Amino acid sequence: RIPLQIVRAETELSAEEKAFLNAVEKGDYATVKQALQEAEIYYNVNINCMDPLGRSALLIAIENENLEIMELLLNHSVYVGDALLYAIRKEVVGAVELLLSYQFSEFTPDITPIMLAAHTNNYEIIKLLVQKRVTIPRPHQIRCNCVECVSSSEVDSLRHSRSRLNIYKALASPSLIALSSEDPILTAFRLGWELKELSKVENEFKAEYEELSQQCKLFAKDLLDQARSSRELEIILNHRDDLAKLKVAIKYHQKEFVAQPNCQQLLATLWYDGFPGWRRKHWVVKLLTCMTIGFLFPMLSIAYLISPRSNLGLFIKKPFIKFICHTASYLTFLFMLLLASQHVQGPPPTVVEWMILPWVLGFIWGEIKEMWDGGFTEYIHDWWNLMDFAMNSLYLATISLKIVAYVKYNGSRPREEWEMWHPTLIAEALFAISNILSSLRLISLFTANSHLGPLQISLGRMLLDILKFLFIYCLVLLAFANGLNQLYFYYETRAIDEPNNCKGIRCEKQNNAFSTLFETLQSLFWSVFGLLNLYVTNVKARHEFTEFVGATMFGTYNVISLVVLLNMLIAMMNNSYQLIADHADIEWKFARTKLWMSYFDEGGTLPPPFNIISLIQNQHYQEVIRNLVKRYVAAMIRNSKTTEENFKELKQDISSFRYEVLDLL
Amino acid sequence: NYEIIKLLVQKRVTIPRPHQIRCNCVECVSSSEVDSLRHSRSRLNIYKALASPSLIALSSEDPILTAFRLGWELKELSKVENEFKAEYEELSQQCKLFAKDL
Amino acid sequence: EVIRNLVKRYVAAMIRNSKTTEENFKELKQDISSFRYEVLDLL
Amino acid sequence: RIPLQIVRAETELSAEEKAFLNAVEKGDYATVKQALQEAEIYYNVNINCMDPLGRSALLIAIENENLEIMELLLNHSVYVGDALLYAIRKEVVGAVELLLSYQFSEFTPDITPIMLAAHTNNYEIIKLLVQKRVTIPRPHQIRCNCVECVSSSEVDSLRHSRSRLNIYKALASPSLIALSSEDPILTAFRLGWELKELSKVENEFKAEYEELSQQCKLFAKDLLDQARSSRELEIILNHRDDLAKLKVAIKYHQKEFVAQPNCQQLLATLWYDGFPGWRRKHWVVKLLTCMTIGFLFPMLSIAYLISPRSNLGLFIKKPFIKFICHTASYLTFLFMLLLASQHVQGPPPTVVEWMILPWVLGFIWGEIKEMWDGGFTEYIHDWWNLMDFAMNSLYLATISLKIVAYVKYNGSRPREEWEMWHPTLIAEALFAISNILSSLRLISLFTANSHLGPLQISLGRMLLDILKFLFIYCLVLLAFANGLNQLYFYYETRAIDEPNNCKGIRCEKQNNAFSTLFETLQSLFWSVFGLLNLYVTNVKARHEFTEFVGATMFGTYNVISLVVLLNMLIAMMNNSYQLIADHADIEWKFARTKLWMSYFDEGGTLPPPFNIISLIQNQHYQEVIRNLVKRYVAAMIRNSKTTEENFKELKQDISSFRYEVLDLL
Amino acid sequence: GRMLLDILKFLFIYCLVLLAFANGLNQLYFYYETRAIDEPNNCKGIRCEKQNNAFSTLFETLQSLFWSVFGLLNLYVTNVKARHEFTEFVGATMFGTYNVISLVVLLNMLIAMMNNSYQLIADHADIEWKFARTKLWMSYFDEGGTLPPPFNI
Ligand SMILES: CCCCCCCCCCCCCCCCCCCC(=O)O[C@H](COC(=O)CCCCCCCCCCCCCC)COP(=O)(O)OCCN
Ligand SMILES: CCCCCCCCCCCCCCCCCCCC(=O)O[C@H](COC(=O)CCCCCCCCCCCCCC)COP(=O)(O)OCCN
Ligand SMILES: CCCC/C=C/CCCCCCCC(=O)OC[C@H](CO)OC(=O)CCCCCCC/C=C\CCCCC
Ligand SMILES: CCCC/C=C/CCCCCCCC(=O)OC[C@H](CO)OC(=O)CCCCCCC/C=C\CCCCC
Ligand SMILES: CCCC/C=C/CCCCCCCC(=O)OC[C@H](CO)OC(=O)CCCCCCC/C=C\CCCCC
Ligand SMILES: CC(C)CCC[C@@H](C)[C@H]1CC[C@H]2[C@@H]3CC=C4C[C@@H](OC(=O)CCC(=O)O)CC[C@]4(C)[C@H]3CC[C@]12C
Ligand SMILES: CC(C)CCC[C@@H](C)[C@H]1CC[C@H]2[C@@H]3CC=C4C[C@@H](OC(=O)CCC(=O)O)CC[C@]4(C)[C@H]3CC[C@]12C
Ligand SMILES: Nc1nc2ccc(OC(F)(F)F)cc2s1
Ligand SMILES: Nc1nc2ccc(OC(F)(F)F)cc2s1
Ligand SMILES: [Ca+2]
Ligand SMILES: [Ca+2]
Ligand SMILES: [Zn+2]
Ligand SMILES: [Zn+2]
Ligand SMILES: [Zn+2]
C-alpha cells in the first residue's frame, strides 16, 4: 500500500469561511452581505481567506463576472492586491472600471496593468488604461553592452529574459499599435524587423519572437486590407517618413504587405504603362506583341538615345517595355555566343567576337554603375550579382589572355604541340565557362512568369537543403578517398606502361583510379554517376586480399553515397518542398515585385551595349490612417465575436437571479 | 440567409448587372482609371451577391442552368483577374456545389 | 415543378445542416439580464 | 440592372397567422392559447399554416422542445402528419412520447418511424418504438433476380436503391443491434460482411456501404472492449453458434475485433504454452532458448513419433515450439540446398540430393494433406499456396527429368557438346528456379516478428500499386518494341558475321538489339537498368537518318520509362505507404493471429520430412452478452454526452419562463 | 540517425532476396566455371576488364549481385562458352528478376519508408537535437579528460 497525504500542507478554512466562500461562488448577494456585516461586529470570518485553489472572495467574484458582489466586497475594503491583473486577464470591462475607481500570484512581478492589457490585445481595456498616464519601459538595443544590461543578465538571466519578452509582447500588440502610435504601419514594420533580429540573436525563445514578428507583419497587412479606394492606397504607399512606403516595406521584408492584392493591382497598372488592356488579351496576341517589341529593341534604344521626347524616345521608359528590351538584348547576346562556335597562336578577334565585345563592356559598365548608384549593401543583397561578378571577371580574364596571346605569339603552330598552359587554351576555357554562366543567368527571368516564378522560388528553397546535405556528403567522400588512396598509392604506374600512354580515369581503359588523392576524389565523384568501372579496383600484382579490401571500401562508399545518402536527400527535399508549397505564392509575388521595381528607375534604361554610348501629405496620411485604424478595430472585434467560463458565467447569472427572486418572494 | 433574402425580394429590389468580363465600354474604362480598387471591389461584391445559393433558389427561372453559367463566368473571371483569383475560384466552386446539391 | 420540389428540399436540408459563437452567449446573458430587470421592477 | 422577384411564388401568411406563428416561436403560452381558442369561434387563423421555411406551428413547437405548447397544439387537433419523424430526428424524448400517445416533407416516403429512429442511433427512442410491434422489411439477396426486384429496379432505380440503403442504415444501427438481436456479435459480423459485399457490387453509393460496414466492425470491437474478466472473454471467444467465435471473426475479416488487446493477450498466453514467463525475458535469453529448441527439433519430432505421451513427446504440440521446429526444419532444408552446389549424362543423385528428397516428399505430402483436410476455398485463400504449388511442381519436374536422363543416357559426354534442350540442363535450370522460390518462401515468416511484420504488410500493400503501374509500363514497352523492331529488322545479321560468333545483347559487344521482337523486348527491358549500350542503335550501312530515328525512339523510351514512369511509381508508392502506415498494426496483428492459429491444430504437427514417416453454454453466452450490451450502452451514452439548436432551446426556455412570470405578475 | 533504423529494417528483406537469387544463380552457373589461365588476361572474376565467372562460386555470386545494384556488372556475364541458349536465357531471367526486385521494387519501397520516417521525425528534431547537444556539452564539464591527445599521456 502507498499512503497518500498532503506533503505541502496549508492552512485550512474554517466552517464559516467555507460557507462564506460558497455563498460568494453561488452569487447569493443577501448571504454574502449578511456575512460581511457580521464580520465587522463579531470578527469570526476572515474576508481575505483563500480557497483550496488560492482564490479569495474578490477573485471568485471577478471570475464569475459578478459586478454586484464585486462592488459589495470593494465597499467593505477587502484586500485588492493584483486583483486588477486578474480583471484584465479575464477581459471583463466592468471589473477594470470598478477596480480603477477603487503572496502567491499568477503573474510575474514585472507584469504591469498596461503590459498585461497589451498582452490580452483587448482594445477597450487598453484604451481605458491609456486614457490615464501609463508608460512601458523601453527595451535596450538588441546587442546593447551597457552596465545595466550586463548587470541584470549576470544577476538573473531568467528574470531579465522574461522581462524583455514581456515588454516586446506588450509593444507588439496590434491594439496598442493602433492607439499610441504616430505611424502604425512603419511602427509595425520596424517592430517586426527588430523581433526577427531578436529571434536570430536569442537562441532560446526563438519561436515566441518569431510569432510576435509574424503577428506584426499580419497587422500591417490587415491595415492595408482596410483600404477602400485607390486614392487611399496611393496615399499610403507613396507616404514619405514614388512608392516610398512600398520601398520601405520591401526593405523590411514585409512579404505579406507587398503581396496584398490591391498593392499588386496598383503595381501591375504601373507595370503595363503602355498597354491599358493587357489584362484581357489572348495568349497569341500577347506573344506576338512581345515578339514585336523584342525584335524592335535596337530601334527603341536608338530613339531614346537621339530624342528622348518622342513617341519612340520615351516608349522605352515604360517598365514592361524596358524589361522586354533588356531581355531581347540579352537573348541576342546569347545567340551571338552560340554563333561564336560555328592553328593561329593568339589570333585577332573575329567578327562575332568584335560584336560580342560591346555587350561585355556594357555588362561591366552597368554593374559598376549599379554599384556606384545603389550602394554596397544593396549590391551585395542581390545574389545574382555574385554570378554577374563571376561572369565579368571571367570575360575580363578572357580579354586579357587574348591580348597576351596576340602580343606574345605571331607564328602559326599546330595545337597538338602547344603548351598545356598556353594562353589561348586558358582563354578559351575561361570563355567557355563564361558562356555557361551567361546562359545560366536566364534563371532570374523566371520570376517574371506566373507559371515559372513559384517553381523557381521552390527550387531556390530546396537549394538550402541540398547545401546542408553537401557537408555530410563531402565528409564521407573525403573519408573514403583518404582510405582508398592510402590503400592503393603503392601500385601507382607510369603513363608509359599504360596501353595507350593514357593515365587516369578519363582513358578508354581506366587506370590509376586511386593512385593519388586528387585522382581518388575524382574517381569517387564519378562513381556516383556509375562512370567508374569496377576493374579499377584491380592491381597487377597478385595481392587478392588488397584488391578485395579496396573493392569493399569502394562498395561501402557506393552503398553509403547512393543507397543511404541519396535517399536521405530525396526525403529532405520531399519534406522541404511540402513546407514551402504553402508560401510559394507570397514569396513569388515579393520577388516579382522586386523585379518590377528594378525597372521603375530612370537609371539603366538602355540595355547593353547601348548603355556605354510635406505637411499636407502627412495630414492626408494621418486621416487615411485614422480611417484604416477605425475599420481594422471594428473588423477584428467582429471577427473575435463571430469556453467553460462562459457557461460558468451563465450559471452565475441564473443563480444570482434565482436568489434575488427567492429573497423578494 | 434565405429568410432575410426572401423578405427583401418580397419588395422591388434590383442588383446591378456586371458588364462583360472583357468589356471595353467607356463606363468600365472610366471607372477603372478613376478608381481601380473601388471598381474591382464593387464587381466582386456583385458577383458574391449573384452567386448566393439562396438568391439563386429564389428569383431564377432555371437554378441549375444559372448555377452552371455563373460558375463558368466566375472561373473565367478568376483566370482574367490575376488578383482576387482565390475569391472568384471559391465562388465558382460554391456555385458548382449548389448545382450538385440540387 | 421538379425544380420547385428540389428547391424546397434543398432549402430545408441546408437550414437543417446549418442548425445542426461568443455572440450566442452574449445574447443569452442579455436575455437573462432583461428578464432579471423586468422581475426586479415588477416586484 | 437585374430585376429580382419570386419565380416560384407561394401563398403568403396573413397578418394574424404571422402573429400567431411568432407567438409560437417565442414560446408565449398565453397568447398561443388565446389564438387557438379564438380560432374555434371566429375561424380567422389557420392553425395548420406554414411559415416561409415550410414549418407549421407543431413543427415550430417540436423544434424548440416546447412540450407545453406542443401538447396544447395536440389538444386542439392540429395536423400531425410526419410530425413523429421530425420529433425522432430531433432526438427529443418528450416529443416522441407525446406524439405516440396522440405536402412537402424532409423525409423520403420509404422512411418509417422505426427506420428513422435506427438511423439516429438513439437508444431511448429506438427502445420506445421496439416496445410496440414494429418491423423492418427484409432486404433481398445482394444478387437477387426475383420478379419484384427487377420490376422495382426498372420502374424506379433511384427509389429502389434509396430504399435499400435506408433499410441497411436502419439494420446496421449499433443500438438496434444491441436490442432485438439474439447474438449481437455474430449479427454485426455477418451484417458487416454483407455491407462490404454490397459496397463491391454497388459501384455508386460505395462509400456509404463501406462506412456502414466499418460502423458494424467498430460496434463488434466495442462490445468486445466491454469485457471485464478473462472468464467473460473466454466465454465470448469460445461460443459455438476451441476459439470458435474467434475463427468466425477471422472468416469475416474482422481485423479490429481480432486485434483487440485482450484477445491478443489471450492468444499470446495460448501461443507460449510451454514458457510461462516469456513476456519478461531478456533478448539474449530468448535467442538462446530459440536456438536450443531449433537445434533439437529432430529429437522432438522423433519423440512425438515414438511416444506422444511424454515430457518430450507432447512438448512439440505446443504452438510456439511447433513453429520453432517447423522453422528449424525449413532452415536445414535451405542449408542443404546451399550445400548442394559445393560430365555424366543423367548422373545418380548424390548424398546431398538423397537428403533433400525426403524434404521435398514431405512438402508435397503436407500440401496435399492440407488440401484434403482444410478444403478448396481455404486452400486458395492463402496466397502462399500458389508459391508452394509452384515449388512442388518445379521439384516434381526436376525429379522426372533426372529420372529421364538417368534411364535414357549412360555415356559421359562433355557438357560443351550437349544438346541445348538436354534433359540434365533443363532439370538443373528447374532446380535452380525452385531453390530461388524456396529461399524466397521465408518472407511469410516475417509475420511472426514485431519489427518485420508490419513492414511486410506495408510492402504487400505497395505491391498492388506496383501491379497497377505494371500495365501502363508494359503498354509503353510493347509500343516502343514494336516501333524499334519495325525500324531495325531489315539489318539483321547472322551470328557468323559477329566478331566472336555471338549474336544478341548478352555478348561482350552487343549486337542485333532490335532485330527480332523477342530480342527487342529484352533490350528495352535491360535498358531500364542501363545495361544496353548506345552503339546497338548503329547499323553497318551508312543510313544515318535511320540510325538517328532509332536512337530517338530509344531515347524517348528511356525518357518515358525512367524520368516519367519511374518517378510516377515513386509518387504512387510514397502516397500508398502513407495511407497504409496508420493501419499497419491492426493489419499485422490480424496476419499474426492467422499464423498463430495455423499452429493450434493437431494436424501437421510433424514438420518435413517427419510427416511422411450446448444449452448451458448458450445461457452463459447470453448473460455475458447482456452484461456487455448494458456496459456498451452506458459507455456510448457517456461518450456522446461528454450546436445552434441548443442555444435556440435555451432562448426558448428563457422566453417561456419570462412570459409565464410576466403573466403571473 | 533515425532514418538508419528504417534502413536497417529494410536490410533484412534485401539480404533475404539477395541470398535467394545468389543461391539460384550459383546453382545454375557453377557447372561452367573456368580456370584463370583460360581467361584472356589471366584474370578471373568480376573485377577484370572483361568480367567472367560472375556466378561460378557463391561468394563471387554474392559480389556480382551486389555490384549489379550499382550497374557495374555487365550483361555478358550471363553468357557461357557452350551453346546452351536455354541455360543462358534462364540465368539472364534470374538476373533480370533480381534487378527488377532490388531496384524497381525494393529501392522505391525504401524511399517511401524513409520519406515517411523523415516526416515523422521532423516534428521532434529540435528537442532531440537539444538533448544530444546537452549531452555533448556536459561531457566537457568534467575535470577528467581535459587534455586532448597526445597530451593526455
Ligand atoms: C576549374 C574549372 C571549373 C570549371 C567549372 C565549369 C562549370 C561552371 C558552372 C558552375 C554552375 C554554377 C551554378 C549556379 C546556378 C545558380 C542558379 C540558382 C537559381 C535559383 O533557383 O535560386 C535563385 C538563386 O539566386 C542566387 O542567389 C544567385 C545564383 C548564383 C549565385 C552563385 C553564383 C554561381 C557562380 C559562382 C562562381 C562559379 C565560378 C565557376 C567556376 C533564388 O535565390 P535568390 O537570389 O532570389 O535569393 C533570395 C534572397 N536571398
Ligand atoms: C522461363 C524462365 C523463368 C526464370 C525465372 C527465374 C526467377 C524466378 C523468381 C520469381 C520471383 C517471384 C517473386 C514472388 C515473391 C512474392 C513475395 C511477396 C511477399 C509480400 O510481401 O506480400 C505477401 C505476399 O503473399 C502472397 O500473396 C504470396 C506470395 C507469392 C505469390 C505469387 C507466387 C510467386 C511465384 C509464382 C510462380 C513463379 C514461377 C517462376 C518462373 C503478403 O500477401 P498476403 O498473402 O499476406 O495477402 C493477404 C491477403 N490477400
Ligand atoms: C552514413 C552512415 C551509413 C552507414 C551504412 C552502412 C551500410 C554499409 C553496407 C556496406 C556493404 C558493402 C558490401 C560490399 O562492399 O560488397 C563488395 C565487396 C567487394 O566486392 O564484396 C563483399 O563485401 C563480400 C560480400 C558481398 C555481399 C554484400 C552484402 C550486401 C549488403 C548490403 C547491400 C545493400 C544494398 C542495398 C540495396
Ligand atoms: C507517358 C507519356 C509521357 C510523355 C512524355 C514525353 C517526353 C518525351 C521527351 C523525349 C526526348 C527524346 C530526346 C532524344 O531522344 O534524344 C536522343 C536523340 C537521338 O540521339 O537525339 C535528339 O533527339 C536530338 C536532340 C537532343 C536533345 C534532347 C532534348 C532533351 C529533352 C528532354 C530530356 C528530358 C530529360 C529529363 C532529365
Ligand atoms: C518482393 C517481391 C516483389 C515481386 C515482384 C516481381 C516482379 C518480377 C518481374 C520480373 C521481370 C523479369 C523480366 C526479365 O527478366 O527480362 C530479362 C529476360 C532475360 O533477358 O528476358 C525475358 O524475360 C523475356 C521477356 C522480356 C520482357 C520483360 C517484361 C518486363 C516486365 C516488367 C519490367 C518492369 C520494369 C519496371 C520499369
Ligand atoms: C527553354 C530552352 C529552349 C532555352 C530557350 C532560352 C530562351 C529562348 C527562353 C528561356 C527562358 C525564357 C524566358 C522565361 C521568362 C520570361 C518571362 C515572360 O514574361 C511573361 O511571362 C509575361 C508576363 C509579364 O512578365 O509581364 C517573358 C518571356 C521570358 C523572358 C522568356 C523568354 C524566352 C526565354 C529567355
Ligand atoms: C537475413 C539473411 C542473412 C538471410 C538469413 C536467412 C535466415 C537465417 C533468417 C531470414 C529470416 C529469419 C526469420 C525471420 C522471422 C523470424 C521470427 C522470429 O520470431 C520472433 O520474432 C520471436 C517472437 C515470436 O515469434 O513468438 C523467429 C526467428 C525467425 C523465424 C527468423 C529466423 C532466421 C531467418 C529465417
Ligand atoms: N552581369 C549581368 N547583369 C544582368 C541583368 C539582367 C540580365 O538579363 C537576364 F535575362 F539574364 F536576366 C543579364 C545580366 S548579366
Ligand atoms: N510448400 C511449402 N509449404 C510451407 C510452410 C511453412 C514453411 O516455412 C517457412 F519458413 F518457409 F515459412 C515452408 C513451406 S514450403
Ligand atoms: Ca545585377
Ligand atoms: Ca501452405
Ligand atoms: Zn543596455
Ligand atoms: Zn462596360
Ligand atoms: Zn428479390
Residue numbers in the entry:
A (entry chain B), D (entry chain A): 17 to 118, 135 to 273, 286 to 386, 394 to 664, 706 to 734, 739 to 761
B (entry chain C): 154 to 255
C (entry chain C): 715 to 734, 739 to 761
E (entry chain D): 511 to 663
Copied sentences from the primary study:
In addition, riluzole shows promise in the treatment of psychiatric disorders and neurodegenerative movement disorders due to its neuroprotective effect. It is reported that riluzole can activate the transient receptor potential canonical subfamily member 5 (TRPC5) channel, which is a nonselective calcium-permeant cation channel. TRPC5 is widely expressed in the brain and kidney, and serves as a potential therapeutic target for psychiatric disorders and progressive kidney disease. TRPC5 channel can be activated by diverse stimuli, including external and internal calcium, trivalent lanthanides (La3+, Gd3+), depletion of intracellular Ca2+ stores, reduced extracellular thioredoxin, hypo-osmotic buffer condition, indirect pathways like the stimulation of membrane receptors (receptor activation), and small-molecule activators like Englerin A and riluzole. The overall architecture of riluzole-bound hTRPC5 is similar to the apo state or the clemizole (a TRPC5 inhibitor)-bound structures, with a root-mean-square deviation (RMSD) of 0.781 Å and 0.682 Å, respectively. hTRPC5 with riluzole bound shows a four-fold symmetric homotetramer with dimensions of 100 Å × 100 Å × 130 Å. Each monomer of hTRPC5 is comprised of an intracellular cytosolic domain (ICD) and a transmembrane domain (TMD), which can be further divided into ion channel pore (Segment 5–Segment 6, S5–S6 for short) and VSLD (S1–S4).
The excellent map quality revealed densities of many lipids and ligands, including previously identified diacylglycerol (DAG)9 and riluzole, as well as calcium ion inside the voltage sensor-like domain (VSLD)9. Riluzole binds inside a pocket of VSLD and is adjacent to the Ca2+ ion density with the distance of 4 Å. Specifically, Y374 on S1 and F414 on S2 form π–π stacking interaction with benzothiazole ring of riluzole. D439 on S3 and S495 on S4 form hydrogen bonding (H-bond) with the amine and trifluoromethoxy of riluzole, respectively. The ion permeation pathway of riluzole-bound hTRPC5, lined by pore helices, pore loops, and S6 of four protomers, is constricted at the lower gate formed by I621, N625, and Q629, similar to the apo state and clemizole-bound state, suggesting that our riluzole-bound structure is in a non-conductive closed state, which correlates with the relatively low open probability of TRPC5 upon riluzole stimulation (NPO is around 0.4 at −80 mV).
